[PDB]
Design an enzyme around this catalytic site. Sequence first.
Site, PDB file in Angstrom:
ATOM      1  CB  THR A   1      -0.828  -0.043   1.153  1.00 44.13           C
ATOM      2  OG1 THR A   1      -1.918  -1.019   1.281  1.00 44.13           O
ATOM      3  CG2 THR A   1      -1.553   1.386   1.070  1.00 44.13           C
ATOM      4  CD  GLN A   2       1.911   2.795  -5.242  1.00 41.51           C
ATOM      5  OE1 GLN A   2       2.388   3.982  -5.933  1.00 41.51           O
ATOM      6  NE2 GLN A   2       0.848   2.180  -6.227  1.00 41.51           N
TER       7      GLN A   2
END
Lengths: 232, 232
Positions: A1-2
């Site tokens: 999860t950027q």
Amino acid sequence: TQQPIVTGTSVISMKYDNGVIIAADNLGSYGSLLRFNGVERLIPVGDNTVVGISGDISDMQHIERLLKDLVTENAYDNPLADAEEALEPSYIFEYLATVMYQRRSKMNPLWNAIIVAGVQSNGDQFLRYVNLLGVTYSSPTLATGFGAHMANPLLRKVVDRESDIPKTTVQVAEEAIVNAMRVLYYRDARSSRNFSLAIIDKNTGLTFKKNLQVENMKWDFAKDIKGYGTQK
Amino acid sequence: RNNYDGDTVTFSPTGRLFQVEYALEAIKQGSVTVGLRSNTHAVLVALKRNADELSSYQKKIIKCDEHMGLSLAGLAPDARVLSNYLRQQCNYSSLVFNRKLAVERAGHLLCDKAQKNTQSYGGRPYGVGLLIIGYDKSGAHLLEFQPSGNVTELYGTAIGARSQGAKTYLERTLDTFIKIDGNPDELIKAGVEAISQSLRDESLTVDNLSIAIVGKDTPFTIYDGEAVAKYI
């Protein structure tokens, strides 16, 4: 999860009678540090669309490559493609709407706020939003990020609803986007003086104006402010 | 020789494969169809054949999508497959690209579909000829798909048994049906003539004729039974 590492902030756009304006500051802000200068948000795609992209510059680059392969995709297997099955803003938008959602579903969100502005080859003004929650909506006036809160009301004077489009002209719309910029320059930290402004018209074609400077400069009222509240 | 016709991974000394020519023959063994078109309408007229007269025919027109559809000629097992994939591509374009898929590109993916089983051991070149008609942005098209995968944009063609007589009807009258526009009935009249020359030992019935039409403002519609008794 950027998470966003470097980010563009604010693309503003509006509808007018014979086409559209999309505009944005040129900046890649690395948080509090104004890291990168000359970063260009606005990418021409086909020749009847400019797609502006704010958010993660890291996700932007990747979207730029996908956009270039869409142009290339249209050439492939077509005897011609400059009016046969010519690339419309709408086609581009739909191609993007699908991938932002698909990625959202895999939990690695392309962290962007995107405005696709263009004109169709049917004479129809196109201006629509997609983002990283994969939310879409069509609206006559748009703005992303900080600029949603801040600059979009101001444009909403110029056009409230879709029956004041024929009473707004190209000089007037241009004037409104630049006053909208002035305000983003003053009152937003991740907004630079530098800005680009593109006019896609269905008649004039693409005009891409680069490296405009904010003017109508007010700072001469500042010497009369003395103290914080109480100070002689 | 022809000891070489048992594999589709073996070539001939005469620079052929035997299986692909044989797959060509398989079309002829089946029913008959004639396609022809105009600039603002496209028409297939196809003969329905029945096993016996308690038997109630075989549906020879498969509606692809609401801007494209096709007819079959040759083996039916083969047709159901090729059709399915094609429909899948039209629904993919409509969902992801918000487009009505071009007839030319769609025909070209089919050519690529055919070669997938030709190269690989197992599977076979398909033993059905398809005539695809559609109406896109670039107006009406008629494509002739072949077993080989050769795709040919034509103003009129006919495949199946004793189809050389339709091409003779169409060849004489070539320039005449191009000039027809705005009148679907008259393209049907031309088609009804055509498919007459193809027959031997038969006469047209209200349930032999199956007439398929797509044009500018008319979506794809298949006429059957009591909708082909205005043009019987």
